[PDB]
RNA sequence: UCGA
């Protein structure tokens, strides 16, 4: 006795998908422990791909400016942080770069026009696959801060189904654009199911 | 439910004969007092769009009588909104409120267009609003935009915009009171003790000068602008953006 | 004092000194034209303010 | 959009609600207050604010200021046994000492709540204006004060403890005199304000806005409401929601303010910065038949725009005055940074007089430069008629001593 | 979105006590026109007079 | 007593006698005092009992000065009262001293621990809410009691005490049989579930066992709101001063589900119904079972006498006593004569006047005692049979009930959460009540923080402290008593999380929904809350159309007679300040005082077509006939063209 | 990975069974995901059995007394409300009780049918004093959580079906890896074992995530 | 009398 369907879906101008699910019928108190366990896995324990290290010629540290580019080298570390792509669990490779001209890249790039530069530029970056985040302390490639977050925002509300009473879970998933919100729910449910199958004994 | 079935009793009886369940009032009144679950489905379809005026004695000003759209809840008390509590001067230690139901069609249009609670933000005495956070939501907003000088956990980090800091709060990256530089290209930035002077002027190469401030960091020739703030002030400023822009 | 020296004897007798207003209104032969508030509430009509103005 | 980069209090939240009414209306303003209370309810549970005993931080300078205040009482009681002061001069010294000691304790509470810990549970409820008040905080961590009799006579025995240290049996019956007085004054306040509200309704029940314009030429001159030294209501707060009857031409004949112009919230700040006396339209100067004109009344203060035809303004005026009826209960100091001998001179006829305390002070009834001695800094001070001086010709004062007290009745037994 | 439709109706009318009579006088025409067997429980005649008056306002 | 007085209209006119006060034969109140001789309190002989003659003659010190063990007085400056003024004189110049620090306060104010830390305005409310607490099913003694609860239980008269110093022989649920020693078998009767005046229970439970020595002055059977020995008006449960998600916003209470299924705050209320078979002049009324127009749906609990049996579960709308009344109208309308002539079934001469259960009432019938004539009892004139029905019900704690404590922290429960949603202590124990800490510093309720922090020390130790009010050393008797005894409970090897060095009166509380700890530590403790008589069942009232008045033909007022809410003069001024002219005309014409307008308005909703223009109300036509009887020719006219005629408002 | 082990297993005087488990290793932040989800199921979703109705055979209602018994009908129903029982038939059973003598009545004097046992003996029921006889019988039904009671002289009791009383868990770090170690404390009432309650609570959470990954 |  369980059914799950999507109420509505939406997609903005940039490739950022959004969907709303509905869980019915859940027991009295089971609607909160399902939506809260799905929130911590979808936001933290999800493998993603991001840019971790760049290499620009003529640049020594993170505060020096490079000739030809309007912005500083810190802005290149911030514009390359929000790069939406997927590595498909491969070894770390080397990427190249020769208006914004964001359509060119040396991995399927999702929404390939956000910001690169506004110069009136030769960059060499790498792509790693992992989970979590990493902060690079100062003091070759210049390692930048990278966040592997395939799902950006998860909201859930629990309401009463009927008047033993039942619950209804309304789950909202705001993904990055690399994976589908329906696909991300199937991956997060595989992680929670693998933690209680050896616990059953 | 047991109070709505008595106040809306001529409206439930009319819907029962219209749907074809009963044929008269004697067949409808015996079906109401019996306690069938089909009666509560009729009462759910009646109160939608029917305004109900709520009233607390004594009525000092004219905002002590406001109209609401009722919903059938579980329990035996009136679930009042906490935002209309300074309007009614109501405290939850024994206050009772009178319920009134209009009948005619002209009275329903006057309770909705003139007596609804959403159209009574400003007081009639002064020009100041009374629908505002008063007790428990001021303490939730004072702690959110505060400054805790001990629990930083990653202060002094540069983020790319507003949405980069909201995605870093769902992780364990930053705390609520961490000193966080935020790239924000807007100029309408209000703060406590504002200043226009520029201290610690630092010049980069190729004529680019950095304009340092107490809380801002503007790259002049405006190229970039970094704002030192806390992630609690970004969640507060994001709430006003999704509510005033629809 | 200004509430009892009005043109309406019904609005002054319901406020204060009912035996004094109706004694003066009967001798002078006063007439109430039901103008303003606090009379149509007693009569049972629409008030001249709000939506009962025109 | 704007970025609020400061700590949000209650008074800063009311400016946000009033800004959403002026730009968006009433529907989007109610949605902003509906979303601001979801944000407050979420981060108050996540905070975990709690009251404790040791959260009520008593300042450690209370013991050093209580034993110094009792030394001023002990040097006054021994002077009373020598016949140097009277009973009124002894009573004026005891009450002014304990009331002055509680003012140093009240200021030390706010200083100690900012240096020890800025995020305190008692300080957060009082500084943000959630429910607390500084008159209630000073009774928890400071001194209780000087209570009075049921007739009104201030007892000379103070209550040096508070609600954290615990009161005594003697200090509990003194505090019960004000609790009973504050209880029986509440019940008589609701009966006096209820009869006052009923009398205001019947005198203004037939005041309905019937006509649009009357065509009058009179006006009402309004200025800044100054209650002597300090101001209470500014000029920008009185011009809000009222039409104009005369033009405001301050710089070069400026035509920014014309006749019958509705003054907005930002427009009132522009008129108050140019002139001081503005002639506006008022119902006191209205010439109408049994009514108030639409232009003479002004704006609707609960809607933001002008009033409409056929609505009773006298019922709203009687309700706005009778609603807060249930909640209705000249000399400076001198100092000197140098120690030396003052020079009186023959230019001032400083006569001898007695002050309200039990000390002698030479009263000056004319002007004069009360110049004190100094090495390099010639410290001078002007006199004032009616005040009194303390220093005598030939006395060497200490560092930071009080030179004089310049000035910037009822019969009793 | 009914409260957003009522604030647009009360604005740009110069009399808030007159446009609420035209809503109440139009809801009685919508109730007499809905005398058939089809009765919508979500769209009351008092609510339908506000949506139809705001569409013709523009 | 300067504290205990009712607030509102009778503020100060109705006082209360103090604890040690006594009235002599002349009618003056006296107070006991100990003699002080040369700076030494002579606590060896009887007091003096001064009859308010210590004003202009004696110097009286209160019971708060530090004394020594028979040597002298420790303090050098003793505050006294002389000629209605307070002063501090030498200890060798005083004459009398008080015998107790609770001599000023009454017997109800003395049940509040830490009275010196609370405000006098909230101690006024805490003494009044203690007199409204219902007797629970299983009461529990307080852990932070003052010690005076044992004296108030014996003087109430509802506690069976021993008088013989004997041996207990037989104990059951109805009587206790002992034998006196230095006709020797006395029987102590025990009442079981007797009705009180305020619809509560007066149940007594046995305490002693068979074969136990007793003393004159020993508790043999406690009352309903009385535990073993001392008084018990509430329960000791966990509390936490933390704001939830708006459920404790403005003096609201958030409780858990554990208080529901553990029968905590569950009281028994016994209601009493009344019916009488009077003597109607058309024919005598009698109680039968065969009543007209009632089938087998309500004739299940009758024993062929018209009266219900004992132990029958009655719900809302049943029939307790079936009574008929003869009628002699014979004025049938032509519609009813045609309807009866088709299907037959001619109407009887009787009318159903059966006693029925009101709305929102249920329970179990426990006493069906019938008092008729020729049995040995007197009856009122005009009555044949008097039937009295007592119905008992078991009420649990629900949403909307008014609960309070001993310090004036009243509130109304708005939500009952399960135990998995409430916050939990680091040992896994959940939190019962989540109170709001915002109401504490604005009302100076400091003693309720001292009470919960001391009761939490008595929870982990199990010692049941007895703290008398109005101390001892300053700052060493309230803070270091609580924090000193909390350190002793943390010295156990199993309980190391009870006390913390950084934050003393706080621990770390975890969230029940997400499992994450809160950012700041929260004060927890064992609070003693009471359950008041202002339940949610007695405040429910609603009316569509019921009875009307006799003269003005207006709806009546009252919950027990289906009355309507009054729309007074302050409520008209709010609608007159609005634009609601059609709502004001509707509330005054078709809802009250119109015999014609109420018929057409009720017929319009059932048919579906509303009609405007109600008629003239009845209350104006009553005033028109009353002014014409005063000798005033008052009438209403018409100002139409060439016609000035009087209008007939009545006809 | 995911090595489940038992640290200690305490047992009170036939009234409580305390066991301490351990989980090692885990992820960087999954010490709260496994811990809090297992706590909410163990305290609200575990089924149990208790006494639902009592026919005392001679008193019709609950507000009366029996001649010779120290306690009335209400204090008997409160002592049987806290009775620890279990069953396997998933059907309402009937157990009888007789008592003749001046001694106290315990849980060992019951007459329960097959596949129904009393876990805790010496449970205090009302006492008899040399002159009466009690012939009450009870009904044992299964359920989940707490039920609201809103035949022939049967007195309904709002029984509870929670075998687990309190669950406590702490998250500890292991020693670069951010992995955690989760320990769990389960306190039962004797009706079920903490090792059996952990297997039943893990069955509900695993079945709550079966159709969320196959259809999606 | 008692609640707001
Ligand atoms: Mg209140
Ligand atoms: Zn005018």
Residue numbers in the entry:
A (entry chain B): 3 to 100, 106 to 113, 118 to 131, 136 to 154, 162 to 185, 189 to 226
B (entry chain D): 377 to 597, 602 to 626
C (entry chain Z): 1171 to 1224
D (entry chain Z): 1 to 329, 343 to 391, 395 to 424, 431 to 435
E (entry chain E): 11 to 68
F (entry chain C): 413 to 594, 602 to 890, 892 to 1071
G (entry chain A): 3 to 152, 164 to 188, 192 to 232
Sentences from the paper on this structure:
Second, cyanobacterial RNAP contains by far the largest sequence insertion 3 (SI3) “insertion” in its β′2 subunit (630 residues in Synechocystis sp. PCC 6803; shortened as Syn6803 herein) out of all bacterial RNAPs. The largest by far SI3 (~65 kDa) of cyanobacteria stretches across the “body” of RNAP and interacts with the initiation factor σ, thus sealing the main cleft of the enzyme.
The Syn6803 RPitc complex was reconstituted using the recombinant Syn6803 RNAP, Syn6803 σA, a nucleic-acid scaffold composed of a 26-bp upstream dsDNA, a premelted 13-bp transcription bubble, a 28-bp downstream dsDNA, and a 4-nt RNA primer. Our structure shows that in cyanobacterial RPitc, the RNAP-σA holoenzyme adopts the closed conformation of its clamp domain, induces near 90° bend of the promoter DNA at both junctions of the transcription bubble, and accommodates the promoter DNA as other bacterial RNAP-σA holoenzymes. Our structure shows that the RNAP-β′1 and RNAP-β′2 subunits are split at a loop region located at the surface of RNAP. Cyanobacterial RNAP SI3 folds into a seahorse-shaped structure that can be further divided into four domains: SI3-tail (residues 343 to 424), SI3-fin (residues 884 to 973 and 424 to 478), SI3-body (residues 478 to 619 and 729 to 884), and SI3-head (residues 619 to 729). The SI3-tail and SI3-fin bind the loop and stem of the rim helices, respectively; SI3-fin contacts the β-lobe loop that stabilizes the downstream dsDNA; SI3-body extends to the top of the main cleft and shields the lobe and protrusion domains; and SI3-head interacts with σA. The SI3-σ interaction forms an arch-like structure that inhibits opening of the RNAP clamp and provides a physical obstacle that prevents the single-stranded DNA of the transcription bubble from dissociating and rewinding.
